[PDB]
Symmetry: D2
Subunit: 321 residues, 4 copies
């Protein structure tokens, strides 16, 4: 904090080291929500659920998972002991102690959509490929699940973005938590979307649109639009234009504490559309604003080895293929 | 600052202790020595140095600056020219003699300041005359009052990389980047990149750039990297014209240790550069270790860390 | 002239059915079999800077005893409607309705005021043979507007009375079979996803890939400075015979833009596994859904757009490129 | 062709060009081939058995087989006692010392990558027909599978095989005038200079831009899958007549890759204000310094490389593209 022989820097933040973080259970978990990728995961699902119940724990699954014809007379005993919820009708946000994901892709996106406030710890398993969000192998799953419950497992606090859509009626405000990104794209050539950073007009996006992503979302849609692969321990917000009219408009990475305000330019002839992790697509009209900030509710991803090692392994596998 | 509770039963159990957007400069003692680093700049150089001396301060400059016939022929500036405290770039170490640095003109003035201060760096106040750039936020108009205001200020702590080359061990502090390229070799490079001891990949292409957020607007930008705000703690790995098009630029946490060396199967040698200078050959068995330096470059703001960068981007776009 | 002998013993047989007879793309000139009488004037919409040049050019063309056509909506604009001086001229225009009237065989040559969509709007009106297009720039040079409005009278006269140079800007013929519909595009045909696309791309009957990404742009060398430019394509001189296939934000980063010969036939359709529908658009217009079983067949049109040159096809593009890289 | 109701383009004999259809070209032997040059990919053990098999067959078919001296020096070839009889019957040449340009009737390449580059460097005039085999992956320049090679080699010798005439660039370096033929590209880079390059690019005498970056790649459609691919260029079918100009890590992000007509003349030289020197490479070989006053003139060569086809120019490339996008 000393700069040369006479100067120094004089507000102080208290953050735990992202590389040293571990999970703690104030009380032993009892309710577990199981999420599986929407056929190879049928036997692992059946095996996991039987184990969790034999370990005296209430298992939650979406109603549609048990409706699948593949889900068996032998599994009937377990099938009857499940706690089911309906995705579009039921709120299980405050009922779940722990989350287990079977398979990759949108399992963690789906977990994030169910938990729009505090997110319970997430243990993600891979069956097919390693991916970036599923570090655990299903081999010796019983001992690993036990070590996560009984021990102090390492975690990556995968940041999320808080997205507030204010629409003129009074006014109506809608809040969304995105794990990967928030896309603002043109309606059916040139969008006219104004991007403000901490109150400063940064630019008017003219092109297909803009992706505002988290380091977790750096391997998602933004990757395809020219963004960098960002380790989930890097505190930042990424702004990636989609097919910009100005080729000089390169992807941008800003500090996690900035506030983004996105709205249609007053001169905008056409409307724009906003999407939250590819879901809940809705129109942005004149007078409507989208405010993006880093959420105070990150997704706690449990680790196999540690935050750095797990991502490096996923990167090494990514660059081997 | 995230909520540390995860659902109804879990939470997180090493604790680190300043907001990068709220940082300001403090003088334990008033500055007495200023280092000035700089044809369009000749009159503002004379103007500034006459002002700094009139404000009772020892002004340091490199010997070659005063050797210039534009400075040497000026008889009026002969009184000031004699009062400067000179140093020789390659022979003299002024690292612990300078209290504050002033840069005239853009480009490699900050790179040059970084090379002179391989330990703690005094605060840098950079002026632009031509274009705004990304590292020169101050306008030379009303400089007298601006400098008075800086002495009697907001700052960005621009991180640097600590580079260790073992072939004999050599240490270098780089402000922008360290480039490892194939040099005169036609054949694609065979550079092994290790992150915290883990072999990530073998770079096959023109090479790899390992940069700081400050260096993101430099060479890495041209190689497909993102523009990273200097308040983001991170190290960047950008391949140069990679053979695999899927090999995207990478941004890693500031606390990782990078190890770069030739692949055992490498038929040709690689070359390492430090902020474009001190180019040298990398042979088999030689290693380049890269970590974030504990000595960042303190760049003084015209407005604030966020606003300054946004305007440099507004001018860029 | 390439040497047709390959080493001491081999060569390529120079057969009459293999030798093509193409007019030099760099040496082409315009000829009037009869003097033009009708002119179509197209001006960039909602640009106030073009109002005075429009009125000036229209007054001149009529004073040169010629029927000046404009779309009805152009004269409806309050900027034109409020001007009392332009009344005499305003009454002498032949107006047509964009969506109702076919002026394809009534127009002798076209004049464009400003860049952007002016030329693609001309292409949409002429789905068969296209009359000569003389495009003017007011703001920046651009790539499709070579003429300066300074001394326009003499230039318009030189184009009518002389043998002006031309670039035959190729177009694509697009057949949509859902019922068959035919479209001519100057720049591109975009096949994009609805709110991961699963669009199959066939080249001369061969399935090349399934596009998982935002979609695909199939463009002409003229379209290379348009939408495809923003999606990572190259700038292609309009005298280069080719079809461009540019993916939009592909899932596979290794999927680079592709340039194929002008004589290939592209067939685009939804992959059998496509859960969502795709959308096809023609120079950003006439957007329509693509369902399972529907096909889009793309070939080079036999009706290219004749763009009049200030100097020549090569010189004009080089000048536009030099100005493009100066900015 | 007509353009609207009254205009057309004058079809003049001095304007009409007589170009061979690139899709219809086939190989003809004026005399049966006797001397074959065999080129195999360096540091690849998988090609050793195919090499031995091929060279035993060619000699059994009473033909003189040429190989570079270093190929037979390899311990894998040198130790094999069974291959000794064939090893003694080869005509060896020394790469940089011997000129075999007028001794070879036919070229066979084993494996991809630099094999065709190496063939091109040996034949700076007329190039004998090239039959390229793939063992590992299909690639873009090796269409033949080594399975049933005997019958394929015979069909190429006894028949009228289809051919792609892969254009080359003629490069004249005046620094003393030297001439070079490149199959893929000519690179002009900043070399060891920390400072951004200052390379002036002229197209048909017109100064287009000053490249300030790592440098510029001037490539052929064949070279589009080589170095230029890595620098942001498009994949161009080898039947597209064109020259490609791709900047390497340009200082201006707006500087996109460019595709120009095959008949343009490029002149590259240092900007008068250039503080540092540039370096010119020819297919990654013969690297040399470019000082003030030195010029590089690039045009399409009159000696293209005749690549023999498995099926045809279009089909072969589409298959290579389909395999490229499958991986």
């Amino acid at each position: 904090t000393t700069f040369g022989p006479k100067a120094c820097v004089l507000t102080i933040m208290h953050i735990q080291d992202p590389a040293s973080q571990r999970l703690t259970w104030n009380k032993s978990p009892k309710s577990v929500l199981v999420i599986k990728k929407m056929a190879s995961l049928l036997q692992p699902f059946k095996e996991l659920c039987t184990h969790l119940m034999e370990e005296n724990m209430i298992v939650y699954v979406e109603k549609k998972v048990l409706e699948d014809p593949a889900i068996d007379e032998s599994f009937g005993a377990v099938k009857k002991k499940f706690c089911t919820f309906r995705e579009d009708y039921d709120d299980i946000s405050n009922q779940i102690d722990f989350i287990i994901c079977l398979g990759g892709d949108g399992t963690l996106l789906y977990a994030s959509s169910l938990f729009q406030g505090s997110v319970p710890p997430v243990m993600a398993f891979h069956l097919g490929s390693l991916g970036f969000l599923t570090p655990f192998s299903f081999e010796n799953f019983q001992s690993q699940v036990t070590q996560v419950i009984e021990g102090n497992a390492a975690v990556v606090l995968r940041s999320r973005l808080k997205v507030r859509v204010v629409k003129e009626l009074g006014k109506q405000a809608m809040q969304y938590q995105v794990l990967n990104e928030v896309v603002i794209d043109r309606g059916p050539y040139l969008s006219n979307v104004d991007v403000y950073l901490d109150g400063h007009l940064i630019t008017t996006v003219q092109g297909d649109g803009v992706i505002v992503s988290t380091p977790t979302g750096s391997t998602a849609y933004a990757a395809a639009a020219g963004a960098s692969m960002i380790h989930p321990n890097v505190p930042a917000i990424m702004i990636t234009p989609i097919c910009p009219h100005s080729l000089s408009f390169r992807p941008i990475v800003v500090p996690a504490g900035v506030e983004l305000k996105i709205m249609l330019s007053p001169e905008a002839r056409n409307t724009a559309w906003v999407s939250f992790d590819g879901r809940k697509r809705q129109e942005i009209r004149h007078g409507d604003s989208i405010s993006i900030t880093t959420s105070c509710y990150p997704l706690p991803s449990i680790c196999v080895r540690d935050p750095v090692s797990d991502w490096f392994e996923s990167l090494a596998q990514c660059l081997h293929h």
